[PDB]
Amino acid sequence: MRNYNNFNRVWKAPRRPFEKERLDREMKLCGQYGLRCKREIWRVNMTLSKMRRTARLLLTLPENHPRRLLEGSAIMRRCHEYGFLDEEKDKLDYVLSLTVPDILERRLQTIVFKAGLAKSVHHARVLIQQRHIAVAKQIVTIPSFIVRVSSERHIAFADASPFGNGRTGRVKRVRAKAAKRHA
Amino acid sequence: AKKHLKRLYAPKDWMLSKLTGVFAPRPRPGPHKLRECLPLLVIIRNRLKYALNAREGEMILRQGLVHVDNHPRRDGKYPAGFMDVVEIPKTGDRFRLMYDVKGRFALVNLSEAEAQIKLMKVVNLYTATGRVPVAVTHDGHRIRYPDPHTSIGDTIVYNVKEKKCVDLIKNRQGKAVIVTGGANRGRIGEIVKVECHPGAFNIAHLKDASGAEFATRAANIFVIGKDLNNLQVTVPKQQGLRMNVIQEREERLIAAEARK
Amino acid sequence: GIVRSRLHKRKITGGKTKIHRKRMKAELGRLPANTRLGARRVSPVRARGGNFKIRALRLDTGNFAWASEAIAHRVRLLDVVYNATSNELVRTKTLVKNCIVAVDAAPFKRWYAKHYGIDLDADKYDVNKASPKLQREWTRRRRNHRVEKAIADQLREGRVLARITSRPGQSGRADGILLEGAELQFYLKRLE
Amino acid sequence: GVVHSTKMHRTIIIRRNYLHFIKKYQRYQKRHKSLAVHCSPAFDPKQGDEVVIGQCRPLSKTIRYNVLEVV
RNA sequence: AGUGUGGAGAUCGAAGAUGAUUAGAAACCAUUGUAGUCCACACUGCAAACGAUGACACCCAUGAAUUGGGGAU
RNA sequence: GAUCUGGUUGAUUCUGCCAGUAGUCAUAUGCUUGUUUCAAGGACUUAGCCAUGCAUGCCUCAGAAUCACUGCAGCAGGAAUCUGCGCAUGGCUCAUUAAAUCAGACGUAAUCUGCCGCAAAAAUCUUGCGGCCGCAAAAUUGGAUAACUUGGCGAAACGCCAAGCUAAUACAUGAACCAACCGGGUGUUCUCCACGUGAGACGCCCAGCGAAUGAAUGACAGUAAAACCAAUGCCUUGCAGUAACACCCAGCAGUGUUGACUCAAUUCAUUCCGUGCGAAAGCCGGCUUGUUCCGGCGUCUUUUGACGAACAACUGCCCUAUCAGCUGGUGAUGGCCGUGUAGUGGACUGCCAUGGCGUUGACGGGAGCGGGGGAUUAGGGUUCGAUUCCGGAGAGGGAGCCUGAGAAAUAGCUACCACUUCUACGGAGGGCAGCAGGCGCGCAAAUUGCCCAAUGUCAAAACAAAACGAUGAGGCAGCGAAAAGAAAUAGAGUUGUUUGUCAUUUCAAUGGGGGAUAUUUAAACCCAUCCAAUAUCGAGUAACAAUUGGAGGACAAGUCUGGUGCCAGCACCCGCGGUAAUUCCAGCUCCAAAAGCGUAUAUUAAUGCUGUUGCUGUUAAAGGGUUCGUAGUUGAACUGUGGGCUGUGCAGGGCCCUUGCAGCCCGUGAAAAAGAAACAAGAAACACGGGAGUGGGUCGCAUGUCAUGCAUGCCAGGGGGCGUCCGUGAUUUUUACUGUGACUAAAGAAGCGUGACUAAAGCAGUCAUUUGACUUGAAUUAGAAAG
RNA sequence: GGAAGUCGGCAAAAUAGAUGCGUAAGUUCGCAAGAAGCAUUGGCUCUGAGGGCAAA
Ligand SMILES: [K+]
Ligand SMILES: [K+]
Ligand SMILES: [K+]
Ligand SMILES: [K+]
Ligand SMILES: [K+]
Ligand SMILES: [K+]
Ligand SMILES: [K+]
Ligand SMILES: [K+]
Ligand SMILES: [K+]
Ligand SMILES: [K+]
Ligand SMILES: [K+]
Ligand SMILES: [K+]
Ligand SMILES: [Mg+2]
Ligand SMILES: [Mg+2]
Ligand SMILES: [Mg+2]
Ligand SMILES: [Mg+2]
Ligand SMILES: [Mg+2]
Ligand SMILES: [Mg+2]
Ligand SMILES: [Mg+2]
Ligand SMILES: [Mg+2]
Ligand SMILES: [Mg+2]
Ligand SMILES: [Mg+2]
Ligand SMILES: [Mg+2]
Ligand SMILES: [Mg+2]
Ligand SMILES: [Mg+2]
Ligand SMILES: [Mg+2]
Ligand SMILES: [Mg+2]
Ligand SMILES: [Mg+2]
Ligand SMILES: [Mg+2]
Ligand SMILES: [Mg+2]
Ligand SMILES: [Mg+2]
Ligand SMILES: [Mg+2]
Ligand SMILES: [Mg+2]
Ligand SMILES: [Mg+2]
Ligand SMILES: [Mg+2]
Ligand SMILES: [Mg+2]
Ligand SMILES: [Mg+2]
Ligand SMILES: [Mg+2]
Ligand SMILES: [Mg+2]
Ligand SMILES: [Mg+2]
Ligand code: NA
Ligand code: NA
Ligand code: NA
Ligand code: NA
Ligand code: NA
């Protein structure tokens, strides 16, 4: 009753439920990137589709069209700052050829593993889930945190986490209480 | 009649979020139309931020602190529309309401003794009882004895303190005008030629300082000076020029980067 | 009650309008005055907006104006002699706008003598009593003005035809003007 | 419009013929509208003529326009 | 084909009759035969009423023919 | 992502449907459910029926208190009750409803309009003193009636009488002088001039706003000179100059507006009878405390401009012809005079004339409240919209009406029909399609919860101080697998059994959860912070144990089973089952999705199986038996290569030709001043200061001086050129289309910017740490058709 | 009260003139039809409408 906030959707199920090629390809993306289910991939697919559709529209207008000149320039900034597109790729046609693995490459769970912080991509997810990593000195507890290129050098352990400037973690805390009580 | 005004039905220039309030201050009748006015509660709370709530807004207004056209107003629903001098002596704000290039309301701060100088556009010329020529203006004021050369469409600069008109600016080509309606509203430009269609609306072709050729209905223009170079009163900070949106985007991105 | 809306009317196509709304006070009607000749009886009506309408029931006098002389006098109403709507309104002596009436012609005779010094019959005004300065004024007016025989004969008889120009059921008064020119000659044929 | 019928007294019927565009089929269709117009004795138009009408107050159940020219 | 009213009624022939065939066979076959079939006037308007192929217009490769009108020898 | 697959045959290629497949803020249901954010929620059917409680009331410096009310010592609060304002807004629901409602765009010059803004206001014979007269002047007006008291009636009743006081800003009456300008009608009135458009004073009758009737204004704008006569100006004793005016006013209006007004406003004549008008004959504050103190209010009239109301209608708006004619006694289309209305109008009476609508679908019938919008979609489209914003309508069904500015009002009245409740049987009551909640209906849908803290509404009203307004509107919680975003169920090792599985040995970490110095919050609950800062609990089967359908094909997953033996069954379709079941009824494993997954019914895509884009008609379904033939659709060519010069392109076969520039009376004629020829209505010929902010470009001296004449000129003239207005003239030119622009509510959909930790969001916020910058931002779009 | 009387509505009752509106099945399209049914009606005092002849 008179509630006025949007709640949209971010994913779509595949049209053909049982494709051997699609099921095996999606299972490869799950283990290789450490995802809990296929909805993360389908979220990525919807994310990539939307940029593709608006790009498709922009390339039909002349390069001097103010809508093309403004929204084309904007979508380049969105691609470069989030690391999706290489900075020397300046044309609007390189957005079209964007791929699914490129988007998950910028996920924090991927970047944490690739920076040497996490030995495995599954270690990265739980480590992020356990408030152990801070981006620009801000705790992030979400594996799907797409990181900008300018914030890549600020990735570190959170100053509150046991691995760093914070107090000791749970195991070193509960067992210490056990020894003191046993006295 | 109706007394409530819904949040969504409220004018967009008031900048009230659709999540905080279900209702909005319905502007009680007065000098300005409720579609073209900021209620004195909205002005004192959402624009000047002197009031935290609406309950703290009635505290200020009922005290008689807020002066409009050299007159204290106590009702929070007071229209307090365009080209009015608002003064709060406790803080000495002494600003007037104007329209910026994007068409929104602007609290243009005024200098000392500039508050006395105020303009208003003649909308109707008629005789009152006893053969008295009377001119009513966009503010709703009635001038009992105007200039013999004053016509409809001209603006008289009117002294609020003296309660007397001091000069007249006739609506002709080659004058400085500011648009008051539509998306074109808030742009200062020069009347190059006005096309007169009897019965229907009149079309005013304008040309601002930068050379942009734009038009609008003649009921939206407001003479503000004799020429584009010299204006009677101060205008919002953009100087009435709407620059390109792409260049609007580039400069603010550069300025934001210059901070870092 | 009585309504003035178009919902009960047939469409120009002849179809029947299906009404989906109850009657409204903003479209009401009232019962007519049927104002008759008699001693002054009126009834106020509280119209919309607080204003009062004076529903006249009977009337006997009103200001009747001589148009060609820009003069008007209060006279009593003697009879109603013509109605363009129906004979039943004449027969019942119903006072409505544009109805032809007969009024007392005495004040117009007194005024004419006081103004031009021409007593048509020739308390009562005496022309010869006027100071000698006045006859100079009368001579100036007599060259400016020339009266019609048809009207003058009506003054001599004592009753003059007139036409009601007010709405008795709306304003509560029965004012009129005297029939002059071709308008009078139009109604004389019907009355004959 | 065009004078359609002059069979009343001081009143004429005019036709406003126009083409309506159907968006789905990308094509037009001929449509017409009828108006009852008061005609002064200064004009005396004929069937098939051409008139200019102007909007006035309700003059009758159907009349809201008055003849301004006859072409 | 059927209907109405007047004709006509040679042949053929729904219905019907008789004889065969047949397990049965007023079916195919045989001999007949009414209405029809033919005409005038008036109805009906139901076809494999078909080229199972709507009408109008333009372009369109080849050989031998065919019907009507023209031109040349 | 502009996508298909299984089923007709012994096989084949088609047509064609069935079945499959994905989505739905799309409903129900079955199974299952650890965290968090954001949420729809008795619409579908019965606009069915309902107990209870609440939902619209309101007071301060500022209308009224002698509460036998309170506290102090007359003051300050102040119940009740008059008075004033509001209750016509909000909130529900969607029954009615197709030239109606509605959307966009226009009107009201056809009107009404409380609260709110800005203005205007000279009518008025009053009062205290002696007998209408005289004196005098800060006007020292009059009756009620509330509350309250007494008596009370009545079962009760949001029921009632009678008597005594008593107020107000309730009701009524009424203010002469101080205090003007202004004109009309007059006097057998007085002073004069010659012997009447003569002049001057004085007496009286009217000359206020508004309303009624009538008369005049509310402009002209297509000619130049003389006589003549009467009157009146002047010079002096005949017409040059010259506003108008027989003074106390020597310019105190010869000039409203609109596109257009019978409008605004002014003058003249008659009129206002309750159906109008006070300086409320009002209240409160300040100082210098004033028969002239200065403010804040409050109110009656008049006025317009805002907030609204009502009416009208330019284009648009589902299915149906097994609905073809509709309307017109007794209004149907129009006219005349009226009536009624706030106003126009056949809205209505009387009288006239036959009109008005329809195959471009009238009339009738059926389903529906209309938009903004939702779902789906390559595009075109198809479909849904009771539901939060806007418009309309209703309050069981009907119909009438009072008050009020505004109601045909319903938590207002009156009546009838259906139902209904209390009663002392005399009688009196009711209207949840408000909130919360019951019964029935159903496949189907929350708590008789907290609070005015935010947003707003009303109100006599800032807050505070004996001093705290109402609010089931609304906000915040409970229930809530409609739906949506982020996300648990674990991360690493050493040894043995290139990898990899399995049995070990462990290691560290976080959350669910338990709490708090506390934070949030009206208070709470939720989230966020923390497990001491000297001092804050907890995961190893990390039992803090994941389900729903399947495993012949479509369609990912088995030579395992075991029975039934065409049975029991499965199976959306094809099919499985008749004793070695591919399909049945279970284990394991495996598959798919996953805190989610089946089933049913609708709808979109699939579907080029509705085809405008974009289908098919020989034989698959489908060209009418043939001609004629109206509406309807479609419809053949033609007014039409512009030329020259310089430079330039692998030009090409002095000429033609791309690109760039300058010329062209830009066919021919006839001379670009003129005239002529083309044109030119956005043109030309007249003609208007009341046309141009003083008649547009091109420092003392003339007028005159009883003049704020303190005013005018200071180039003379001519000539054309133009911004405005009017009249006269083209044997008069539009529309579709297309390019720009104006006009156009949010919510919703795109989109710029924005690390709300991310996202679904929101329009915020960022920085130095500062007594503030960013003169912070809140961009831009699209949104049918018609105008 | 209303056919319960009686073989049986026998007999009686009942409807009724004129004007306007309205009228079903069936049909040989002519009818059925006065189908069936509603409504008005008096007396007075008026007002309209419907004509003949003569005159430049
Ligand atoms: K949405
Ligand atoms: K207008
Ligand atoms: K035979
Ligand atoms: K009251
Ligand atoms: K009329
Ligand atoms: K609504
Ligand atoms: K099985
Ligand atoms: K098309
Ligand atoms: K055929
Ligand atoms: K009976
Ligand atoms: K018997
Ligand atoms: K009968
Ligand atoms: Mg025959
Ligand atoms: Mg035979
Ligand atoms: Mg056939
Ligand atoms: Mg065929
Ligand atoms: Mg077959
Ligand atoms: Mg299917
Ligand atoms: Mg409402
Ligand atoms: Mg409905
Ligand atoms: Mg809708
Ligand atoms: Mg419904
Ligand atoms: Mg209602
Ligand atoms: Mg009900
Ligand atoms: Mg009601
Ligand atoms: Mg109720
Ligand atoms: Mg009721
Ligand atoms: Mg309820
Ligand atoms: Mg087996
Ligand atoms: Mg299924
Ligand atoms: Mg579909
Ligand atoms: Mg389709
Ligand atoms: Mg398709
Ligand atoms: Mg097909
Ligand atoms: Mg076939
Ligand atoms: Mg052609
Ligand atoms: Mg030439
Ligand atoms: Mg939005
Ligand atoms: Mg008998
Ligand atoms: Mg019949
Ligand atoms: Na046989
Ligand atoms: Na054939
Ligand atoms: Na032939
Ligand atoms: Na087969
Ligand atoms: Na009997």
From Swiss-Prot, chain C:
Keywords assigned: Ribonucleoprotein, Ribosomal protein
GO cellular component: cytoplasm; cytosolic small ribosomal subunit; nucleolus
Disulfide bonds: none
Transmembrane spans: none
InterPro entries xrefs: Ribosomal_eS8, Ribosomal_eS8_CS, Ribosomal_protein_eS8_euk, Ribosomal_Se8/biogenesis_NSA2
Annotated family: Belongs to the eukaryotic ribosomal protein eS8 family.
Organism of origin: Leishmania major
GO terms classed as biological process: maturation of SSU-rRNA from tricistronic rRNA transcript (SSU-rRNA, 5.8S rRNA, LSU-rRNA); translation
Record-given protein name: Small ribosomal subunit protein eS8
Superkingdom per UniProt: Eukaryota
Molecular function, one GO term: structural constituent of ribosome
CDD domains registered for this protein in UniProt: Ribosomal_S8e_like
